[PDB]
A paper describes a structure:
The L segment encodes the L protein, an approximately 250 kDa polymerase. The polymerase is a multifunctional enzyme that contains an N-terminal His+ endonuclease, a RNA-dependent RNA polymerase (RdRp), and a presumed cap binding domain (CBD) at the C-terminus. The viral polymerase carries out both transcription (production of viral mRNA) and replication (production of genomic RNA). Here we establish the expression and purification of the polymerase from the Old World Hantaan virus and characterise the structure using Cryo-EM.
We first collected single particle cryogenic electron microscopy (cryo-EM) data of the viral polymerase in the absence of viral RNA promoters. From this dataset, we were able to determine the structure of the polymerase in two conformations comprising either only the polymerase core (residues 226–1600) or with the core and the endonuclease ordered (residues 1–1600) to resolutions of 2.8 Å and 3.24 Å, respectively. In these structures, the C-terminal domains were not observed. In our RNA free model motif F is positioned such that it would block the RNA template entry channel. In our RNA-free HTNV structures we observed the loop 921-EEYIS-925 in a retracted conformation. This retracted conformation is similar to that observed for LACV polymerase pre-initiation conformation, RNA-free DBV, or RNA-free Lassa virus polymerase structures.
Residue numbers in the entry: 226 to 392, 402 to 432, 448 to 515, 523 to 675, 700 to 1455, 1483 to 1600
The structure:
C-alpha cells in the first residue's frame, strides 16, 4: 500500500529563456575564480601571509615544548627486565643523590630518589613483585609504586606540587632568526636520530631486499634504540596509569641508570625524565634544568602531563615509524626502480620517528592541508592563495612546526617554479607525482585519530552549522520564506542578479536540468522502473543489516531537554518493543511522518567503526533519508556506464568514455565559415577541471530536489512512489539541531562571552536546540546530489550548445563519489589570430554580444558559465580545492581517491598496531593478521605486509606474554613445540602473509589437526595424540556456534574464553531476555544463525541476543576511556581466562591443557568430529575464495537457512530472504552434491552441516584486491600476481 501524497505540477520552463540569460550574462566581463600558478605568486602569497600573521598575533620569544619524552642514547639499548630495572634504579639514584638541585622540580627529583634509596628490603621485594604475589607494606601500598608523604618533601617540592595541582601566542615566523633557530634545533635532533649507535619462497626475497636494505640499515640507528627505550618508558607509564596505582609515586631506570623516570601521583599521568645529556631527543631550552657533576651533565625535564591516547601513540611510535619507512621504501622502489641509499632511508626513518613521537593537532592539520597544496601548485590554475592562507589559521608554537612550515614553503615554491618532483623528506627527486603525494599521505597518517574530536573541533562544527542556519534565516527574512523554499523564478533572477547565490535555487533551472536528464533516462524507462521496484519497498524495515547496525543515532528528548546519543540497534529494539509488527519502509514512514527531524553531534566517547561524519539523526529522519536514497540510487544506477561510476565493471567506463571522447575530438581540426566557402581553421585543445562538486555543503538547500524528483522520469505508471519521495524530502526540510552537554558546559564555564558566542547562544532560545532549514546535516543524500549535479552539468552542456551552434566546442564530465572531472574542449586560432578576432567583432556588431566572452580564453568562459549554471541549482564549486590543468596528473588520482577501495594501505598497516578488540589472544592476533591481509589486498607489497605481520604478532605476544622466554610461553607448560601449539593456546600460526591471504587466518589450526590425525591414525604416535588431546581440551573449554553478526574471529576447533570489559551500566534492553532463554532460543533456532528474522518477536529476541554478544558490547564501547585503558593493561599476570567456572591466569589454562592432553584417549566420535572439522594501471579485480556453483541461484545463507528451517516462521523468513524462493530445494541438492564432491561429507548426517556451514558462508563472501596489470577475477590469477610481486625491484615470472 502507498498513500496519496501531493506532488508538484510542471511550471512553464523554456530553455530559450535560460539561453537568453546566458547571452546577457556572457556579454560582460566575469572574474575567473582561480589564479595562475607561478613561483613568484606562491612566494608572495607566503610572504604576505607571514606579514599578516605576525601582526595579528602576540609574538613570543620562547618556543614551546614539542618532545613529550626527552632522553639520549650512546650505546645499544637492551630491553628492560624486572631484574635490570632494580639495578639501574639503585645506581641511578646513587648518581642523582650526588647532585645539587636548583629548581623545585629538581628538588622533587632529589626527594623521590632519596625516598627510593631508603626503602626496606621487603619494600624492594614487594615493589617488583607481581600483583598475584604482592603484599602490602607500610611504604609500598601498590606494586611498582611507593608512598611519599608531605613530611619527606622539602619546601621547594611542596611548592612545585602546589603549583601543579592548583592550576594564544605565536612565534615570529616572518623573522629569519626564529627560522634559523628552529631549523638548527630540528636538524640537530634529526642528525642525532640518524647517527649509528655504538624456508618460504618469500623469505629469500625478504632477506635479500627488505632485511638487507631496510632492516639491516635502520637496526644500527639511534632512532631504533630510542624507539625501544620509549616503548619501555611508555610501558612503565601505562602500568602506573592504573586506577589503584596512579595515586602513588613511582621510579624506574633504564639504560644502565642513564635514564630515570619519576612518576607523580596522577585523566592525565604526570612524570619527569632525568637523563644524561648526549645525542638523542634533547631540547636543552625546554628542559627544567641541567645539573653538573663534573664532566657529566644531567638534564631534568619539566613535569610532563600525558593522556592515554598520546601514551598509546608513543608506545607504538617505533612500529609506526618503521611501517611508514617501509611504505616509503616500497614507493621508492616502485618509482625509481631500485633501492634507496642508506642515508635517504635513515633520514626518512628519523623524520617518521620524530613525527610519530610528536602528536600535535597543528602538525596533523599542516600535513592534511599539504595534500591539497601539492596539487594546487603543480597545475596551471588553482586556488592556492586560499590553501596557503589556511596554513596560518593556527599559531606556530614549537620549533618543529616552524621547521615543517619552512620545508613546506621551500617545497611548494620549488614545485610552482617547475611548471621531476622534489621529495619532502629527503634529497631525492621523484619521477612521478603519485610518489610525492604518497609521501605526504604517509606522513599525514602518522597522526592518530584519537586527537581529533577535542573540545575545539566540535565547537567549530557547531558554530559552522549555526552560522549557515542564521544566513538561511537572513535570506528568508529578506526574500520571503516561500521564495527561499520553493525557489525563485527566472524573471526574478533577470531582475535581481543577487538571487543567484548559494542556499537559493531557480525553479526553472531545476526543471530544465530534470528535462535534460530525462532526455537520456527515457530510453531506459523499463530498466529504471524495474530497478526502482527491486528496492523492496515492502520488505520489513528492521530486518536489514543497515537498520540494526552499531552506527550512532539520536535517541529521545530527555527530561533535562537534550537529545540522547544512542545506537541504531537500541532504537530498533525500542521501536519493536512498543510495536506489534515489523513495518516496511513506507509503513514506518507513514507512522512517523508527523515527527520533526532532529539531529545532534555524535559523542566522541560513543563513536564506532560504522560511524561516518559528525551528525546523528533520529529514526524518522533516517527512514526519510533511506526512502530518498533507495529511490535515487535505483534511478542513478542506469547512467552508471555514462556519468557516475559505482563499482566493479562500471567503475571505470565513465572516465574511459569521457577521456577517450576528449582525445578523439582533440585529434581533429575545426573550420568556421566567416563568409562564402572561405573558412577559418582552429586548433582543438582540452582543459581539465577537477572539483568536489557533489560533496555535501552545510550551505545547501534540500528543497531543490523536490521539484527535481517531481520532474525526473522514473518509468513507473503512477506517481505514488514519486510523491512519497517528494513528501519525504518535504519532511526533512526543518530539523531541530541540539547542542552537546559538553559544549553547554564549556560555554557556561567561560566568564567572558565572545560576540560570536553570544549569537551562537541566541540561536538556541531554550538552551538546547534550534531550528535549521535547508541543510540536511550530512544526511545520506549522496546519489540524489550526484544525479542532480549530472543533470545540472547536462543543462549547462545544452545551454552552451545553443549559445554557439557554429562552434564545435566540446564538453564531457564524470562523477565519482564527491569528485567530478570536467573536460572542456575549446578552440584556439592557428598561426596568428587575426581572422578570428575579425570574425568575433563582426559577430558582436551583428548583435551577438555573447561573443565578447569567446574572444580569448574560451575555456575560461565555458567554466564561468558552467559554474554559474551550477550555482543556479545552489551548487558552489569550491574556490580552494578545485584544480585546473591542461593535462590529467592530479585528476586521475583525486578522482578515484575517496572510494572504499582506493584507500591507501598505509592507514590499514598503521591501524593494525592499535584498536585491537581486546577479546583474547587468539581474537587479537586474528584481528591484527586480518588487517595486514587487507592491507596486502589494498596494494601493500608482500614484504611490507610481512614486516607488518611480524610487528603486530610481536606486539600481541608481548601484550599477552606468550613470546619465548616470557611468563605464558606455551613451550614451558606444554609437551609440544611453539609451532605445534594451537593458536588459542598461545601459538602464533603460519606467520606468512602469502598463506594468511590465500588459505585463511584459522586454517593453521586445521592443518595442525590434519597432521595430528594422519600421524595418530597411521603410527599411533604419543605426541600426535597429545596434540589431539590439546584440541579436544580447547573444544571442551568453548565450542560456540557461528553467528553471522558476531564481529570476532570464529574458531572451528575450540577457543579459550577471556574476560571482557564490563561497562558501568549495561546497554538498554540488554536485560529484556535472560541468558538461559537466549541460549535455548539459539539452540532451537539454527536458521537464525544465517538469516535475520522477519517477524517482530523473533527479531526482538535476535536483536536482544545480538546486544548481549561479547564482540558487540566490545565494539559499542570501543572509544570508552575505561575500555581503552583496559586494553592497554598487560594480561601477562592477570586472571582473565575462564577455567572450571573461575577466572585464572593463562599459564594455569596451559597447565590444565597439558594435564588433559597427557591423560587423553581417542574415541570414535572424537575421530569422526576431528575428520569432519578438517576437510602500470591499478584496477580493483574482485575474486572469491572458492566461487559459487552456477547452479546455485540463491545466496549461501539462504540455502543454509532453508536447510535448517523447521518452524513455519523460520521457513517464511527463509522464503522472504531468498531472492528465488521457488528454486530452493534445487540449490540444496546442488550444495549437498558439491559438499560430497569436494569435502567428501554428507550434510544430511547429523551435526555435519552445523560444523561445515561456516566454511561455506566464508566461501560465499568476496574480496576486492588492487592488482597492477592484466590480472583476471579468478583467485588463481590473483595468487600468481602476488607471487610475481614478491620481489620489489626485479620481475620473478
Amino acid at each position: 500500500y502507498i498513500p496519496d501524497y501531493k506532488g508538484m505540477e510542471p511550471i512553464g520552463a523554456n530553455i530559450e529563456d535560460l539561453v537568453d540569460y546566458s547571452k546577457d550574462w556572457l556579454s560582460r566581463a566575469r572574474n575567473f575564480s582561480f589564479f595562475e600558478v607561478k613561483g613568484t605568486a606562491v612566494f608572495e602569497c607566503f610572504n604576505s601571509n607571514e606579514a599578516n600573521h605576525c601582526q595579528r598575533y602576540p609574538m613570543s620569544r620562547k618556543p614551546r615544548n614539542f618532545l613529550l619524552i626527552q632522553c639520549s642514547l650512546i650505546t645499544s639499548y637492551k630491553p628492560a627486565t624486572t631484574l635490570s630495572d632494580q639495578i639501574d634504579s639503585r645506581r641511578a639514584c646513587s648518581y642523582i643523590l650526588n647532585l645539587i638541585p636548583d629548581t623545585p622540580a629538581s628538588y622533587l627529583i632529589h626527594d623521590m630518589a632519596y625516598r627510593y634509596i631508603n626503602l626496606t628490603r621487603e619494600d624492594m621485594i614487594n615493589y617488583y613483585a607481581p600483583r598475584i604475589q604482592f603484599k602490602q607494606t607500610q611504604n609500598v601500598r601498590e606494586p611498582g609504586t611507593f608512598k611519599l608523604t608531605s613530611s619527606m618533601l622539602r619546601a621547594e617540592s611542596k611548592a612545585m606540587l602546589d603549583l601543579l595541582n592548583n592550576h594564544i601566542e605565536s612565534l615570529n615566523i616572518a623573522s629569519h632568526i626564529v627560522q634559523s633557530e628552529s631549523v638548527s634545533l630540528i636538524t640537530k635532533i634529526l642528525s642525532d636520530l640518524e647517527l649509528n649507535i655504538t624456508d618460504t619462497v618469500l623469505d629469500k626475497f625478504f632477506q635479500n631486499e627488505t632485511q638487507k636494505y631496510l632492516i639491516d640499515v635502520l637496526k644500527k640507528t639511534t632512532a631504533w634504540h630510542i624507539g625501544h627505550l620509549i616503548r619501555d618508558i611508555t610501558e612503565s607509564l601505562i602500568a602506573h596509569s592504573g586506577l589503584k596505582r596512579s595515586k602513588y609515586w613511582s621510579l624506574h631506570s633504564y639504560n644502565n641508570g642513564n635514564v630515570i623516570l619519576f612518576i607523580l601521583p596522577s585523566s592525565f599521568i604526570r612524570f619527569i625524565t632525568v637523563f644524561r645529556i648526549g645525542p638523542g631527543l634533547v631540547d636543552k631550552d625546554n628542559l627544567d634544568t641541567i645539573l653538573i657533576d663534573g664532566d657529566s651533565q644531567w638534564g631534568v625535564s619539566k613535569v610532563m602531563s600525558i593522556d592515554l591516547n598520546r601514551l598509546l601513540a608513543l608506545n607504538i611510535a617505533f612500529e609506526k615509524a618503521l611501517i611508514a619507512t617501509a611504505t616509503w621504501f616500497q614507493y621508492y622502489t616502485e618509482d625509481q626502480g631500485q633501492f634507496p641509499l642508506q642515508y635517504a632511508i635513515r633520514s626518512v626513518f628519523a623524520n617518521h620517528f620524530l613525527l610519530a613521537i610528536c602528536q600535535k593537532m597543528k602538525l596533523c592539520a599542516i600535513f592534511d592541508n599539504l595534500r591539497y597544496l601539492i596539487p594546487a601548485v603543480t597545475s596551471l590554475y588553482s586556488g592556492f592563495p586560499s590553501l596557503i592562507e589556511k596554513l596560518f589559521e593556527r599559531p606556530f608554537k614549537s620549533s618543529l612546526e616552524v621547521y615543517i612550515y619552512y620545508n613546506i614553503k621551500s617545497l611548494l615554491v620549488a614545485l610552482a617554479q617547475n611548471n621531476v618532483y622534489p621529495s619532502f623528506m629527503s634529497r631525492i627527486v621523484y619521477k612521478h607525482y603519485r610518489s610525492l603525494i604518497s609521501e605526504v599521505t604517509t606522513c599525514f597518517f602518522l597522526f592518530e585519530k584519537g586527537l581529533h574530536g577535542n573540545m575545539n573541533e566540535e565547537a567549530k562544527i557547531h558554530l559552522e552549522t549555526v552560522e549557515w542556519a542564521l544566513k538561511f534565516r537572513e535570506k528568508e527574512e529578506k526574500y520571503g520564506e516561500s521564495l527561499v523554499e520553493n525557489g525563485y523564478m527566472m524573471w526574478e533572477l533577470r531582475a535581481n542578479a543577487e538571487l543567484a547565490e548559494q542556499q537559493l535555487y531557480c525553479q526553472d533551472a531545476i526543471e530544465l536540468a530534470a528535462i535534460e536528464l530525462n532526455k537520456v533516462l527515457a530510453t531506459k524507462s523499463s530498466v529504471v522502473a524495474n530497478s526502482i521496484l527491486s528496492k523492496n519497498w515492502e520488505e520489513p524495515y528492521f530486518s536489514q543489516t543497515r537498520n540494526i547496525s552499531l552506527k550512532g543515532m539520536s535517541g529521545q528528548v530527555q527530561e533535562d531537554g537534550h537529545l540522547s546519543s544512542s545506537v541504531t540497534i537500541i532504537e530498533a529494539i525500542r521501536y519493536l518493543s512498543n510495536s506489534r509488527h515489523n513495518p516496511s519502509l513506507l509503513k514506518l514512514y507513514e507512522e512517523t511522518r508527523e515527527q520533526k527531524a532532529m539531529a545532534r553531534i555524535v559523542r566522541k566517547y560513543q563513536r564506532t567503526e560504522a560511524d561516518r561524519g559528525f551528525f546523528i539523526t533520529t529514526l524518522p529522519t533516517r527512514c526519510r533519508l533511506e526512502i530518498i536514497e533507495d529511490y535515487y540510487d535505483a534511478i542513478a544506477k542506469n547512467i552508471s556506464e555514462e556519468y557516475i561510476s559505482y563499482g566493479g565493471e562500471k567503475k571505470i567506463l565513465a572516465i574511459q568514455g569521457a577521456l577517450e571522447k576528449a582525445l578523439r575530438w582533440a585529434s581533429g581540426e575545426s573550420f568556421i565559415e566567416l563568409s562564402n566557402h572561405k573558412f577559418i581553421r582552429m586548433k582543438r585543445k582540452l582543459m581539465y577541471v577537477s572539483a568536489d562538486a557533489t560533496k555535501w555543503s552545510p550551505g545547501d538547500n534540500s528543497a531543490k530536489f523536490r521539484r527535481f524528483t517531481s520532474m525526473l522520469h522514473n518509468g513507473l505508471p503512477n506517481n505514488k512512489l514519486k510523491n512519497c519521495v517528494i513528501d519525504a524530502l518535504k519532511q526533512v526540510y526543518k530539523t531541530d539541531f541540539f547542542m552537546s552537554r559538553k559544549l553547554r558546559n564549556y560555554i557556561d564555564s567561560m566568564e567572558s562571552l565572545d560576540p560570536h558566542i553570544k549569537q551562537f547562544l541566541d540561536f538556541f532560545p531554550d538552551g538546547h536546540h534550534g531550528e535549521v532549514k535547508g541543510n540536511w546535516l550530512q544526511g545520506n543524500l549522496n546519489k540524489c546530489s550526484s544525479l542532480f549535479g549530472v543533470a545540472m552539468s547536462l543543462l549547462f552542456k545544452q545551454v552552451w550548445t545553443n549559445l554557439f551552434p557554429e562552434l564545435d566546442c566540446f564538453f564531457e564530465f564524470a562523477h565519482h563519489s564527491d569528485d567530478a572531472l570536467f573536460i572542456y574542449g575549446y578552440l584556439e586560432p592557428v598561426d596568428d589570430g587575426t581572422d578570428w578576432f575579425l570574425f568575433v567583432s563582426q559577430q558582436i556588431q551583428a548583435g551577438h554580444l555573447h561573443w565578447f566572452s569567446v574572444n580569448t580564453e574560451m575555456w575560461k568562459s565555458m567554466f564561468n558559465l558552467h559554474e554559474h549554471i551550477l550555482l543556479l541549482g545552489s551548487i558552489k564549486i569550491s574556490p580552494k580545492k578545485t584544480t585546473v590543468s591542461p593535462t590529467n596528473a592530479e585528476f586521475l588520482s583525486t578522482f578515484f581517491e575517496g572510494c572504499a577501495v582506493s584507500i591507501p594501505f598505509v592507514k590499514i598497516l598503521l591501524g593494525s598496531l592499535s584498536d585491537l578488540p581486546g577479546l583474547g589472544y587468539f581474537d587479537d592476533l586474528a584481528a591484527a593478521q586480518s588487517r595486514c591481509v587487507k592491507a596486502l589486498d589494498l596494494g601493500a607489497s608482500p614484504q611490507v605486509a610481512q614486516l607488518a605481520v611480524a610487528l603486530c604478532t610481536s606486539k600481541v605476544e608481548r601484550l599477552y606474554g606468550t613470546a619465548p622466554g616470557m611468563v605464558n610461553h606455551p613451550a614451558a607448560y606444554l609437551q609440544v613445540k611453539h609451532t605445534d601449539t594451537p593458536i588459542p593456546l598461545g601459538g602464533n600460526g603460519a606467520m606468512s602473509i602469502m598463506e594468511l591471504a590465500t588459505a585463511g587466518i584459522g586454517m593453521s589450526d586445521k592443518n595442525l589437526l590434519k597432521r595430528a590425525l594422519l600421524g595418530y591414525s597411521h603410527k599411533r604416535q604419543k605426541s600426535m595424540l597429545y596434540i589431539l588431546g590439546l584440541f579436544k581440551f580447547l573444544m571442551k573449554l568453548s565450542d560456540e556456534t557461528f553467528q553471522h553478526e558476531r564481529l570476532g574471529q570464529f574458531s572451528f576447533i575450540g577457543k579459550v574464553q577471556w574476560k571482557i570489559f564490563t561497562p558501568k551500566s549495561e546497554f538498554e534492553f540488554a536485560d529484556m531476555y535472560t541468558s538461559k532463554f537466549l541460549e535455548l532460543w539459539s539452540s532451537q533456532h539454527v536458521t537464525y544463525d544465517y538469516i535475520i528474522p522477519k517477524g517482530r518477536d523473533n527479531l526482538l529476541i535476535y536483536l536482544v541476543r545480538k546486544l548481549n554478544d561479547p564482540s558487540i558490547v566490545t565494539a559499542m564501547t570501543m572509544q570508552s576511556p575505561l575500555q581503552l585503558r583496559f586494553r592497554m593493561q598487560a594480561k601477562q599476570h592477570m586472571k582473565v581466562c575462564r577455567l572450571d567456572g573461575e577466572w585464572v591466569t593463562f599459564r594455569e589454562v596451559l597447565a590444565a591443557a597439558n594435564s588433559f592432553a597427557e591423560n587423553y584417549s581417542a574415541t570414535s566420535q572424537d575421530m569422526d568430529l576431528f575428520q569432519t572439522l578438517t576437510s602500470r594501471a591499478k584496477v580493483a579485480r574482485t575474486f572469491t575464495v572458492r566461487e559459487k556453483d552456477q547452479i546455485i541461484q540463491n545466496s549461501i545463507p539462504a540455502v543454509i537457512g532453508y536447510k535448517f528451517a523447521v518452524t513455519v516462521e523460520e521457513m517464511s523468513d527463509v522464503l522472504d530472504t531468498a531472492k528465488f524462493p521457488d528454486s530452493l530445494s534445487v540449490d540444496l541438492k546442488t550444495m549437498k552434491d558439491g559438499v560430497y564432491r569436494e569435502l567428501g561429507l554428507d550434510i544430511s548426517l547429523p551435526d555435519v552441516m552445523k560444523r561445515i556451514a561456516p566454511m561455506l558462508y566464508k566461501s560465499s563472501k568476496s574480496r576486492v584486491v588492487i592488482v597492477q596489470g592484466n590480472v583476471e577475477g579468478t583467485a588463481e590469477a590473483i595468487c600468481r600476481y602476488w607471487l610475481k610481486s614478491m620481489s620489489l625491484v626485479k620481475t620473478i615470472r
